[PDB]
Amino acid sequence: QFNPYGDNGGTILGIAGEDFAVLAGDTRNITDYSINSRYEPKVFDCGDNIVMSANGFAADGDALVKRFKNSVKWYHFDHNDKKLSINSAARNIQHLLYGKRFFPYYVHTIIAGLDEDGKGAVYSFDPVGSYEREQCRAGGAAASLIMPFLDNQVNFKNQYEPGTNGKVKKPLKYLSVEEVIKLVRDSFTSATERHIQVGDGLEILIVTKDGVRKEFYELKRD
Amino acid sequence: TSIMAVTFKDGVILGADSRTTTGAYIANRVTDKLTRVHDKIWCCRSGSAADTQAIADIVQYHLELYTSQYGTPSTETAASVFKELCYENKDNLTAGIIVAGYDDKNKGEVYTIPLGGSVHKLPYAIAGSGSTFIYGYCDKNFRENMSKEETVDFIKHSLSQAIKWDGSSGGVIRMVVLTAAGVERLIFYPDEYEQL
Amino acid sequence: TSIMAVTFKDGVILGADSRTTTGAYIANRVTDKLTRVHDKIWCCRSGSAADTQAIADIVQYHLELYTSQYGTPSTETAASVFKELCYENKDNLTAGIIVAGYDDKNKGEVYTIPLGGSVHKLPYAIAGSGSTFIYGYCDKNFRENMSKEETVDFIKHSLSQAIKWDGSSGGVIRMVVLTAAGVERLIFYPDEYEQL
Amino acid sequence: MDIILGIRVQDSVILASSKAVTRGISVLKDSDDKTRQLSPHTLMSFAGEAGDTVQFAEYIQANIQLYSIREDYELSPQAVSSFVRQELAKSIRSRRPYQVNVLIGGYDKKKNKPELYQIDYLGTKVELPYGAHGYSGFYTFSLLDHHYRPDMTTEEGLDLLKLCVQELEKRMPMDFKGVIVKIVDKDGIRQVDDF
Amino acid sequence: MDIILGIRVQDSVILASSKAVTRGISVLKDSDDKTRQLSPHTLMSFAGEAGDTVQFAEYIQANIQLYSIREDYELSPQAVSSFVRQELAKSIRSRRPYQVNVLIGGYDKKKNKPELYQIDYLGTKVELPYGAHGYSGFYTFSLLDHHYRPDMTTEEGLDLLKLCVQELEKRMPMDFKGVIVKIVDKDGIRQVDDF
Amino acid sequence: TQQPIVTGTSVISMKYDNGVIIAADNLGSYGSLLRFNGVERLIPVGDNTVVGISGDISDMQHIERLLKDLVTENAYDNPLADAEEALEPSYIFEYLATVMYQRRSKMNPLWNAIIVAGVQSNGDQFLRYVNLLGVTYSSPTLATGFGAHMANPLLRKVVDRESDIPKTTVQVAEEAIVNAMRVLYYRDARSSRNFSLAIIDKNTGLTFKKNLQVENMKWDFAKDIKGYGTQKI
Amino acid sequence: SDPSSINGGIVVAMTGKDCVAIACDLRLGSQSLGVSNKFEKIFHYGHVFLGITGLATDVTTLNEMFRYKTNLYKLKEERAIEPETFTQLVSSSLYERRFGPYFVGPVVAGINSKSGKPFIAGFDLIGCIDEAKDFIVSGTASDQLFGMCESLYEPNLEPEDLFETISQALLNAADRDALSGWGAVVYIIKKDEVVKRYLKMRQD
Amino acid sequence: TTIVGVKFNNGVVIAADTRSTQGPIVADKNCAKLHRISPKIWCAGAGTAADTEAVTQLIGSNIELHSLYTSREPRVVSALQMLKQHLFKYQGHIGAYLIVAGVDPTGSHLFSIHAEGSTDVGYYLSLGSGSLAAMAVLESHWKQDLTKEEAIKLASDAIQAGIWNDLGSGSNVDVCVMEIGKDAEYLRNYLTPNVREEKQKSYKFPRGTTAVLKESIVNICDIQEE
Amino acid sequence: GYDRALSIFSPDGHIFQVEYALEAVKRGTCAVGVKGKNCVVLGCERRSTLKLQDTRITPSKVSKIDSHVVLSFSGLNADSRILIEKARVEAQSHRLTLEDPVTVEYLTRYVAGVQQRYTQSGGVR
Amino acid sequence: TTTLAFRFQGGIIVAVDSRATAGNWVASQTVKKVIEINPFLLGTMAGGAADCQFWETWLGSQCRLHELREKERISVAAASKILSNLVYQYKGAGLSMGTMICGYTRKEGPTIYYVDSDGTRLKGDIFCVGSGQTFAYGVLDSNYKWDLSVEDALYLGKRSILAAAHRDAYSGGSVNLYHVTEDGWIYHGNHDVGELFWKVKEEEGSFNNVIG
Numbered sequence A: 001q002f003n004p005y006g007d008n009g010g011t012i013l014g015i016a017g018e019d020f021a022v023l024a025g026d027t028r029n030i031t032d033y034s035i036n037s038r039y040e041p042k043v044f045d046c047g048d049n050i051v052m053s054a055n056g057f058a059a060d061g062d063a064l065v066k067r068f069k070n071s072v073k074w075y076h077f078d079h080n081d082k083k084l085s086i087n088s089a090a091r092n093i094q095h096l097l098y099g100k101r102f103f104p105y106y107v108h109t110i111i112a113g114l115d116e117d118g119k120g121a122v123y124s125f126d127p128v129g130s131y132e133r134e135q136c137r138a139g140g141a142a143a144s145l146i147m148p149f150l151d152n153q154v155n156f157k158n159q160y161e162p163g164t165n166g167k168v169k170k171p172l173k174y175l176s177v178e179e180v181i182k183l184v185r186d187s188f189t190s191a192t193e194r195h196i197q198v199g200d201g202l203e204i205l206i207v208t209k210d211g212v213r214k215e216f217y218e219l220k221r222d
Numbered sequence B, C: 001t002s003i004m005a006v007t008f009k010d011g012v013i014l015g016a017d018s019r020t021t022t023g024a025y026i027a028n029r030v031t032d033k034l035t036r037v038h039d040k041i042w043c044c045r046s047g048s049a050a051d052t053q054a055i056a057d058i059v060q061y062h063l064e065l066y067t068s069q070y071g072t073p074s075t076e077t078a079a080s081v082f083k084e085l086c087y088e089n090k091d092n093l094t095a096g097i098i099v100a101g102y103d104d105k106n107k108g109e110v111y112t113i114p115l116g117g118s119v120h121k122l123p124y125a126i127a128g129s130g131s132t133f134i135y136g137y138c139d140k141n142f143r144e145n146m147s148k149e150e151t152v153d154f155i156k157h158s159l160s161q162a163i164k165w166d167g168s169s170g171g172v173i174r175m176v177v178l179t180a181a182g183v184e185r186l187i188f189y190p191d192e193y194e195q196l
Numbered sequence D, E: 001m002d003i004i005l006g007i008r009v010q011d012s013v014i015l016a017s018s019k020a021v022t023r024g025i026s027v028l029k030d031s032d033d034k035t036r037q038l039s040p041h042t043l044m045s046f047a048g049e050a051g052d053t054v055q056f057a058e059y060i061q062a063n064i065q066l067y068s069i070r071e072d073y074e075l076s077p078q079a080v081s082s083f084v085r086q087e088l089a090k091s092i093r094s095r096r097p098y099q100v101n102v103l104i105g106g107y108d109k110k111k112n113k114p115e116l117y118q119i120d121y122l123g124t125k126v127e128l129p130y131g132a133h134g135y136s137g138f139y140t141f142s143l144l145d146h147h148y149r150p151d152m153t154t155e156e157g158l159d160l161l162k163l164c165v166q167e168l169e170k171r172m173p174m175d176f177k178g179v180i181v182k183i184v185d186k187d188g189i190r191q192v193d194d195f
Numbered sequence F: 001t002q003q004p005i006v007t008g009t010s011v012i013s014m015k016y017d018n019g020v021i022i023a024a025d026n027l028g029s030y031g032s033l034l035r036f037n038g039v040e041r042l043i044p045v046g047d048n049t050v051v052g053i054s055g056d057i058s059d060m061q062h063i064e065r066l067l068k069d070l071v072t073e074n075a076y077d078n079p080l081a082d083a084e085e086a087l088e089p090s091y092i093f094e095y096l097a098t099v100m101y102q103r104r105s106k107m108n109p110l111w112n113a114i115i116v117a118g119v120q121s122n123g124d125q126f127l128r129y130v131n132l133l134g135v136t137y138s139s140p141t142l143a144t145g146f147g148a149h150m151a152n153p154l155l156r157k158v159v160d161r162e163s164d165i166p167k168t169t170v171q172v173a174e175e176a177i178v179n180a181m182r183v184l185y186y187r188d189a190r191s192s193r194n195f196s197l198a199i200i201d202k203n204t205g206l207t208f209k210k211n212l213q214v215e216n217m218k219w220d221f222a223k224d225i226k227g228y229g230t231q232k233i
Numbered sequence G: 001s002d003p004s005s006i007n008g009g010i011v012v013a014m015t016g017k018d019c020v021a022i023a024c025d026l027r028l029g030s031q032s033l034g035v036s037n038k039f040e041k042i043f044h045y046g047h048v049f050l051g052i053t054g055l056a057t058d059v060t061t062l063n064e065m066f067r068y069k070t071n072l073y074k075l076k077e078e079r080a081i082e083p084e085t086f087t088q089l090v091s092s093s094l095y096e097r098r099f100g101p102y103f104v105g106p107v108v109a110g111i112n113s114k115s116g117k118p119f120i121a122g123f124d125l126i127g128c129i130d131e132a133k134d135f136i137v138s139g140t141a142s143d144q145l146f147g148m149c150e151s152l153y154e155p156n157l158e159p160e161d162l163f164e165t166i167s168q169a170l171l172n173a174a175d176r177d178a179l180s181g182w183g184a185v186v187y188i189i190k191k192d193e194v195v196k197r198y199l200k201m202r203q204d
Numbered sequence H: 001t002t003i004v005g006v007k008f009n010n011g012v013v014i015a016a017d018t019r020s021t022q023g024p025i026v027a028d029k030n031c032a033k034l035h036r037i038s039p040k041i042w043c044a045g046a047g048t049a050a051d052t053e054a055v056t057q058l059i060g061s062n063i064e065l066h067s068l069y070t071s072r073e074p075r076v077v078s079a080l081q082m083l084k085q086h087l088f089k090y091q092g093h094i095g096a097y098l099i100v101a102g103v104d105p106t107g108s109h110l111f112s113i114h115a116e117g118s119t120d121v122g123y124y125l126s127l128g129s130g131s132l133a134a135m136a137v138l139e140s141h142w143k144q145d146l147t148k149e150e151a152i153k154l155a156s157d158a159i160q161a162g163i164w165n166d167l168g169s170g171s172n173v174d175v176c177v178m179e180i181g182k183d184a185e186y187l188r189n190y191l192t193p194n195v196r197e198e199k200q201k202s203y204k205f206p207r208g209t210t211a212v213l214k215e216s217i218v219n220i221c222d223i224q225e226e
Numbered sequence I: 001g002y003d004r005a006l007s008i009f010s011p012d013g014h015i016f017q018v019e020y021a022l023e024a025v026k027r028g029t030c031a032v033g034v035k036g037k038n039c040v041v042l043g044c045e046r047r048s049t050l051k052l053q054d055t056r057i058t059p060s061k062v063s064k065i066d067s068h069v070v071l072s073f074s075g076l077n078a079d080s081r082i083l084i085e086k087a088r089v090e091a092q093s094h095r096l097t098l099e100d101p102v103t104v105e106y107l108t109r110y111v112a113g114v115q116q117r118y119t120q121s122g123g124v125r
Numbered sequence J: 001t002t003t004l005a006f007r008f009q010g011g012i013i014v015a016v017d018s019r020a021t022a023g024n025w026v027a028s029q030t031v032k033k034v035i036e037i038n039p040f041l042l043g044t045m046a047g048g049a050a051d052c053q054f055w056e057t058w059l060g061s062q063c064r065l066h067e068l069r070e071k072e073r074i075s076v077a078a079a080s081k082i083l084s085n086l087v088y089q090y091k092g093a094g095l096s097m098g099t100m101i102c103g104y105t106r107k108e109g110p111t112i113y114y115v116d117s118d119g120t121r122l123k124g125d126i127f128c129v130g131s132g133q134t135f136a137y138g139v140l141d142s143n144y145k146w147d148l149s150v151e152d153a154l155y156l157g158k159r160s161i162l163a164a165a166h167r168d169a170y171s172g173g174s175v176n177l178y179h180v181t182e183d184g185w186i187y188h189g190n191h192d193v194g195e196l197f198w199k200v201k202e203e204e205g206s207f208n209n210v211i212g
């Protein structure tokens, strides 16, 4: 019997800052125990200061990103070159996903950018289109390895102020872009050590008011 | 089934056994598996008899209509029409057909169309359940540009062995010779080919 | 596998390919499928390598103990011991074995033991997945009382064809000659037998 | 849903239907009315698969109300029951059939006779003095076979119905949270608010 | 069978168990006592597959009674619960396992403390202030989590138990025909005959 | 939904300093039966692209006809069909990738794995993969089926990352490919000795080599191997 | 249905400078239903500590079995069993049930009383030993624990620093697992003092 | 898992990677897959890790008793025969896939072993999920009459192929060289090409960060005197 | 297994091993039973050759078989424990299957049956 | 998941947890399970997250079209029936929903409809849906009165979710409260269950089984 679905591995991570947002993902593509590519880009600049990644089954992932990029193009045509806001992009992606409710895109989608107040924004989707704005989100193979670490180091969960013994929480002070990138790199370095599908390289796309910048870092290739 | 087609100096010859089967019961011991789709384009059938008869009837219709409009079709063209039916309806068909024909420009040609609906042009072809047992014999004994008598002997000996080992094959050996001279039918009975 | 044993004027010769398979991966390309259970009683193995190695080890043990008590066993006796293991454990085994041996009283003998555990004494025998493709060739080319050189050629040519058509078979052609003169091992490489 | 009963006496038809609605683990409601008024003198109770029951009942109700307005005339109970049977007989060979069983209690104003019709989801219709769907009949029919008379009053019918519900509450494993009882006679449809 | 509850208060352990026995379609009995006295100050309630429940309970009872006679001494509730756990842990890897869940309520005369142990058919033991098996806990634990105090009297425990049974009778689909309630304290085991 | 009947095995490929190389054997298997021994599975499109196909042969012959039709169609009303508006490797791949994903989405796939190798207008090397599921990816080396497991490890020792491409000559690359084909013949039961190889270079164009054979094979060591454990004779 | 995730729970162990730490959650459940918040999963036989995750009936059974065996060991050997030796005993005992196994994930922690060397080890349900220098994880949130430990851990941590590291590893891992939590315990183990600390955590 | 075995001039070498996995998760990053059956007979195992280790130690134990009984140094063919007969009996349910190598008074030997009981002989062998990557290297660079230095190089290169290309394999290369007339040299972590880079940040917490309910001293000492 | 026939007939029709077992009973401390109109009393002799005995813990001569039946004995003390254990097990087995405690006659008949069995079984005294 | 809604003197209280799980893995602790259909209507999320999100914001569009066409606020009866009729069309295809459509109009007063993916549409006073529904029902049934104050009703809803969050493994994270009046719904904050549990334990004296 023919199975229309597959699993290309991969792990992605989106974090929203005060006036910025990052969307990172490893560059390794796999089937079963083989490596297809050590550098196959997974996070994409979609225009209008929006970055996107659809992790899971790569055929469905590429199809969805392609259809959204197309949706941005036609939004400009139909609405006098109006900038597609991150919240509007998110709702549009829900309809792309739910359109195949009974034969779904087998992917976990994340987009990142800035909201209309200039503050950092990340949105997260399930395969059939349910979505949520979030501060912090990992997706894919090693998501379960990364999220608990972020709860602890970004949101300071289970951390209290010394001397008070549980009475006063550690205050949620804002993180710089340099500080976030440090946490992203450490997240993927740790995931690479313990998950076989994670490795080769890490590509980070940073979004500010100035635009979209890229950073690349080597990961272990075993 | 044991079926084969072999090109030779003067053209091509098709060969077949005469056994049709439903389980272990021989539903017909004198079957004619060599089928005419055009004057000098014939085919050998294997698989479901319903499927291969339906296909051959449709091809004969297609080539009859081709001939009325564009003149005599090539053997390649006949093979293509067979392929189109076998490929596009692969899910619902169980048919393995060998197409053989004689042009004056191209002389003798053989095309084999296995289950998937692919086409393969070959100097000779073998098919059917009985063909498995004569891959070795045929590869060792086939030569290009044989005479008519040599080719009749090659097919007679080959199908003799296929019949000997395959329970699904048997009865008489039918043959159809395709040359410039015309169309000749041959038949060989058990008492002849069993003693080879 | 492609394995065979052939009796001739001076005794018997066993032949085999060297390819061992787990799916489409060739887990060993230089396997030795010709196995010694006694000085001049050998066998060819086909089926599960685990099963046929276990059986052959047990038979070698049985014949070693037979020899210590009753002297050299006959080839018929060796075949019977193989049969007893294959028949009584038919539910749990996947083994097709050809037993070949040389007595001075009985000369060259060949016994084939298929899946069920039945025994069949034959002038020559073929087995393994590759044997299907050479039933025709072997039946046409086998003669009784051939010479050593003729029998080596018959086996070389036969297994050459089996290897050519069966993906599961390949590598080198190994042979073991069993005569009054002793035991001779032969090996034939691809560059030799592919051009036949 | 679960238990639906019906009894035709001298001058009226009485329908009793359970109040419970259960979503697997929990009882979500204990006051559910499993009935729809099709016309002033015709009442239909129902039981079967969730959703389909109410969807079918309201669909039938809409159709009978449409007929009533078009012709300015109330269809006889026999005519309504035939319409309902055909809809279910059509439904059983559909892509996704209505899994709904009904009882139709009506008072025929022309013949001055009460009438009770039992129809299952296949479209199997029978006119009866008393009827039920599911397992309800297995517990109640032996009592009805014994006590039923064609000349019973409405009060005697309610008493025989109480005996049936008591037997159900004793021997049935499920808690159906009591029944809503409705009477259909020459004056129309009314609910017995204490049962 | 169905619902079995337990609560440990200041000076006693209270076990509540349903009375219904259902053979598929019909309720065959409405006065069944799903408990066995293992020793003068130890009571075990049970629920699971038909036959196996009583067979296991009586088997345990026989063994504890045998110990009591041999040593002229009553085993502590902790010791009895450990014996029972081992029997079930042994049973789960048998040819045909005992499909039985139990609660063990005992008063330890040495420590002068009530004790409640919950053990499932796998041999999973926990000591608890209050416990249950099956779906019983899903309905009752939120009430017990709120109202329970370790210094409650027996009367307060019975009242909290009544609130639990009322919630079960409201939201459970099955009619379990009420509960038999038994108290285990320093004076032994007694049955509350009006509940 | 179907099952593949007549099939083709591994296709292997890699990039080098001035272009790309691709190779595949000439066999069409019918299960374990090595039925057809003269099947060409590398199909050139123009003078800048070679498409290598594995899997179902009937579907391969269909794809071959689609590519033939693509060339015909591109030439229609196109004065620059042999110049600026010729078919690029990237155009040919994207078309195939579209078809493959559409066919899997109708639950009626073309049962193949495909590698498109070529050189673009600006001289850039093109090498990308697509299969029956519509999955696509690129890498300095690419291989299908058994090739993925055995060829890639060998080819990755020559070009391990992007920066190794300019340092790799056509002689070194072809040598690596030919060796990989020998290894596959040793170890894949559905492979043949005969194969085809194609080089697409930005300077010297498309070189298509037919009727190549696996040579320099090591078999001599087999003569010393006896039994399966304890046997000495 | 899957025996190793019916009851839920986690265990983690770490090494430091002249010390080891082992920690576990306190939950026992029947799938979605939380049953007990006092089900401790760490036991000790002399100075050797054993944590066990998995099917709770087997957790209890194995504790009773190893208490049985280490008690007989001590009577015959006239000394307490060491971590290295006990590790082999756990492996042996699990493998004897190769084709009818205990559905558990054991973790050993302790300091060798003669060499002073810190020791930890982990096992699969059938006996395979994992002897890591750094840390060992087990249970229904083992993925989460691997992620925490890999980033938080550094070698040669002092006892009071190691406490903070392992506590934060457990707590944040448990909060990302539905079947783990409801309390937690941490053991800090030195050559001749062991401190046990119950942690305050969310109770959902 | 990637494991190889290579014959050379005066002996045999075996090698293995050091990654053990549970599904997609790496359980141990520095696992020891080279097992000792006897001083000069070593084997490497793939498949069910408990089985490869249990079957090695059982046969190793019986081999030691056999060596003491017969007053002879153990033979590789004995280890092979005992392993295959044990595994055949369990019909593959004991999932042990082994490469067995060693030197004895008869000479140097190299065998492999499938879980269902089948054995084979060779000059070079590979097993595990990375066996195809390893065998590719072996088929490309193996020749007759290799030196010790050449065989170690070839074996570790074959493991590296598994490390880099197979997701089931990773971390380090372990080697064991068994030469005739010499002690077997076990080279643990012969190659270390996968050290983790320094992290960007220290995650050491301030003391008092964790909320504590209760503290208590645990009595690990026995019942005291007086 | 050890099958030797230890209890056998002699020419005069006596089984000596059974008769010598009675001599062991003759050696044991005296036991007496008296039944009144509404009670039964069991009296037992304690030989005072053993002082410095701890009477709290020393095995008592009268043993409860169930809550309603008792057993006293004369003869080998170790042998009596085996009969007492068997009787206690049978008492619980009777309650389990018949759902009624043993009658005194039934319990006696069982113990007597065990004693008889050990007079014509191989390998036992 | 645990979601509830109940009718009372001062309108409707809607209370939900915040947890989403994929097997044993906790995907999110910050899920919005109350869908703000419009300023006057609320819907709860249980079953399929997408099915509930998608079709209830769609419902908001249909309600907006209704009031544009009819120049009048849509009834809760009509709004709930648009959703139930839609999902009934898809019956068999595999939609998963269990929701409470909550509103307060002039003609109806406070109204709650339970709507299900197999077509069920029930009007009622108290509804509770999810894996932790049975725990929340217990607290609700024993403390519910029609004459509750807004302050006490808000607490009862908060407390009932806490009960479920504690016992049900698949419920937790935080509690979202809403109060539905005739003039629209009013949000009453996000309450972390971790902090809420300890606060309620101390102030109420409940959960004596748990050490704090």
Ligand SMILES: [Mg+2]
Pocket: A191, A192, A193, A194, A195, A196, A197, A198, A199, A220, A222
């Ligand atoms: Mg990795």
Ligand SMILES: [Mg+2]
Pocket: C163, C164, C165, C166, C167, C168, C169, C170
């Ligand atoms: Mg071959």
Ligand SMILES: [Mg+2]
Pocket: G174, G175, G176, G177, G178, G179, G180, G181, G182, G204
């Ligand atoms: Mg948790």
Ligand SMILES: [Mg+2]
Pocket: G203, G204, J164, J165, J166, J167, J168, J169, J170, J171, J172
């Ligand atoms: Mg919870």
